[PDB]
Amino acid sequence: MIDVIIAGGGPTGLMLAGELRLHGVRTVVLEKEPTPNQHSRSRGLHARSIEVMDQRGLLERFLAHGEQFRVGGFFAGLAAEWPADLDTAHSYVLAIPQVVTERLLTEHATELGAEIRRGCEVAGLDQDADGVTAELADGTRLRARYLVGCDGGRSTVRRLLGVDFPGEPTRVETLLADVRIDVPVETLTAVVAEVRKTQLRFGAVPAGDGFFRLIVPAQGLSADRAAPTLDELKRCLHATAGTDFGVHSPRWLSRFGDATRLAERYRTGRVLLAGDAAHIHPPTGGQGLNLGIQDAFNLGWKLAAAIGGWAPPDLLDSYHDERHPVAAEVLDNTRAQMTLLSLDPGPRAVRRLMAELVEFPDVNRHLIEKITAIAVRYDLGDGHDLVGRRLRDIPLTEGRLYERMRGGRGLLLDRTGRLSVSGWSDRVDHLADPGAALDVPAALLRPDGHVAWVGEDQDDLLAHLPRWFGAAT
Amino acid sequence: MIDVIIAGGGPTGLMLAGELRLHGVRTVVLEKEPTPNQHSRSRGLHARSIEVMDQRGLLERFLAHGEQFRVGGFFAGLAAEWPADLDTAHSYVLAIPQVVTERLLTEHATELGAEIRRGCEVAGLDQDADGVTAELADGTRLRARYLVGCDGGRSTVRRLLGVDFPGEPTRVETLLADVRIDVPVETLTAVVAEVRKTQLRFGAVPAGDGFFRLIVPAQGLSADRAAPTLDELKRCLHATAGTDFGVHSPRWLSRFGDATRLAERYRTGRVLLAGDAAHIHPPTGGQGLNLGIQDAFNLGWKLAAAIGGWAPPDLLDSYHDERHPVAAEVLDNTRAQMTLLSLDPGPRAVRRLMAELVEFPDVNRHLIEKITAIAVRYDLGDGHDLVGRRLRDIPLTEGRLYERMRGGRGLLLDRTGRLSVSGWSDRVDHLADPGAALDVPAALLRPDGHVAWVGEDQDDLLAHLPRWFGAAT
Ligand SMILES: Cc1cc2nc3c(=O)[nH]c(=O)nc-3n(C[C@H](O)[C@H](O)[C@H](O)COP(=O)(O)OP(=O)(O)OC[C@H]3O[C@@H](n4cnc5c(N)ncnc54)[C@H](O)[C@@H]3O)c2cc1C
Ligand SMILES: Cc1cc2nc3c(=O)[nH]c(=O)nc-3n(C[C@H](O)[C@H](O)[C@H](O)COP(=O)(O)OP(=O)(O)OC[C@H]3O[C@@H](n4cnc5c(N)ncnc54)[C@H](O)[C@@H]3O)c2cc1C
What we know:
The structure is a homodimer of 473-residue chains. Helices cover 31% and strands 22% of the residues of chain A. Chain A has twelve helices and 22 strands. The structure holds flavin-adenine dinucleotide (2 copies). One flavin-adenine dinucleotide binds at residues 7-13, 30-33, 41-43, 98, 121-122, 150-152, 156, 176, 256, 275-276, 283, 286-290, 292 of chain A.
């Protein structure tokens, strides 16, 4: 029997499949497209996603297919330096195309035994007290204990669940185009720099093969929401840059809005939502793909705990309680960024003020920590500021903390030489290392790296173990 | 013969008259209203204006008619603490009604020998190579060497000069009302706090005599721009608070827009502009009256230098070069503040972000230093960061720096015990005090307190003296 069906083989579903396969969960990914999408939206990973890959041993292969960058401008394009005091051991951006990211995640989920089934489109679902049935577009049916809708921003699973998707509608539309041009690159760059003095939703990135990635504001809103024709691209280029640069031969044309919507419930019985299926927003700051990977990273071990039969009764609901607010804040900061990109005189004045403010180090650090998600703090109810946050990588006596996390289990980092997780040993590893560069006596880490407890008393630790690791065995 | 005619007896003109009378300038103020306006717009003075009064010995009488406050919320109503590290010796707000401020400034200009003429409205002007003629509404004429339009935001002088007044038109209108209500004050306060959770352009301040100062957003824009009727006040109260509180018996009704305009030239021959005559903007931050007082403080000694015949040929034009950019930045930060008061979802998201940012001390200090004008730096062409800024009050061996400035002349603060201003002694005082709490060897201060030179070489000081104090005598 299949334990979990994943609808959608994007980065969220692929990352989710990897996290489930770490614990033996029989996992089938139903991906509707017959062949992988060759068009990249995302252009890299932010610090928290980079850490997550390192916690799972995948950073080396990601670094081998990407380039590290330490540049500014990630909050509404506000030029700045990279914050020199970012509280991460992975303080950089990893430039890597989403097609490459999906490739690496596909290969890792496969080698762990996840079953990827392409050309399989979920069309219906029927759940009861024991499992979920997925109905494919060809009439075939698949049965599992749980189904997770990782099927993108226009999620079939979300619609079939009737989950409300409230937020702000699209009011600003932008065009996307991979095209060839009739001007030299230096001519394109000169015009772009002139337009970007006021209109920052205009840009051009070469693809290296003679094609150019163009971003250009749309004119009004479209009724069809369909892909723009080449003619529409030329009209918007003329309106924004005064010329269409002789664009021709598009190999990709697209239109995206700035709508911000959030699923009201991440869980409906035995069906859950993750990634763009649970939340949509503009790509300001490059947060969507990171937000989806970290949804799967939060959900994986919890869902595996359910399949394993040791999950506490509130564990699975903690996926919603923790990730729904994180997405709500992402949506809010993209609405703020979009306003800072507005041409209206009011927002322009606020933008100039933000330019003054980001010159202060604690502002620049605060904005980047927001964009890169390294400052996310779940409300776990404890007074300690570290509890609820992810623990950064730290040097041990030999090696580093993240090298001990590749199994996806719990981890008690103990410097007292006195604590014990006896009774939860199959679920929580005991890292007794007084030489660990951490200024707490001990820290209990969930399998997602988030701190669940800090202290030095054994009896205090024993009372905090059952919430995230169930009953002692 | 009259040296200077001042059109308008508001705080700008009254402050200007005081600065001119310090140097014997025969000064006539032509104020159109027969009796002083008893309605206050401003509710106090910010730090730079407070310092300016202390430099002229007027702070004691201002403090005796006002109350000192150290509270937050001066930038777009963003709640915060008063910055604990504000770089002023006068780190507070002086709560004092504008009617009281105008009263104190009227009495001080009079006791210095300025001639205030009420019921005198400037209707025309005619200038030539030798002077200016003011034509009053009753056909009488007055002749002087210079005329300064300090006649408010709808300046007659500005219009007659044909000076362009570019900027942003009014797009947001707000109502003002001194009225009585039919509800207890605690009922008014409860409703106000509920509305101010989203609409921050709504407020109520008691007047102490049973009347209440109401601020309420208007509905759209008015064609007449005339004063709102009581009916219009009730409609806007219902729309914004759901009730009109039983408002009745208005003793003041007003409407103001958010237009931001700036005179293209502060000087036209022998006619200059100052205060609201040179710039209009919303009252966000309470900056207008301070901006006007500091216009007069910049212009006074320069205009007196012209009348005295020792002004360098570029001195009078430096009034525009220094004050026009200062006003432009005030206008810009009020457009930013208005956006932060917008109800639209975009600006609301940016406001929440600003609320996060102002918790950082250097942000809170930066915004308040902007509002209170203590960080204004004129571009005097020198590399030293202090040059162009006003020097804060500092302790001397005995007393403080500002006590030596009441004559409105130049001041060389010398700690080397070696420098000399011989040749400019009638215009620049020599404060030789090695015990002065200032970490420069010496600083040359203009009569407005702004630093013109810093160093220790006598020959370097002699080359900088003529620019602001003319030829040696
Ligand atoms: C222009 C642009 C630029 C962006 N730039 C960045 C960036 O720089 N950084 C960043 O982090 N993010 C960025 N994003 C966002 C990022 O691309 C998305 O958030 C990311 O793809 C989300 O992954 P996902 O797996 O949730 O969903 P998706 O990638 O949408 O994939 C879901 C999968 O479900 C499949 N599917 C759909 N329906 C069904 C069905 N019924 N049955 C089975 N399978 C189905 C789809 O074929 C697809 O493969 C950008 C987005 C855009 C539009
Ligand atoms: C609601 C509101 C709240 C405000 N709150 C604050 C605040 O908290 N802090 C702050 O600093 N500022 C505030 N301001 C702004 C401040 O009130 C003005 O900037 C200030 O009055 C400017 O002074 P002024 O002397 O230039 O001009 P004004 O005060 O306008 O006075 C000019 C004078 O010229 C006279 N006059 C006009 N035409 C003629 C003519 N033809 N001949 C002769 N005389 C003439 C007028 O009668 C008047 O007395 C506020 C403004 C408003 C509307």
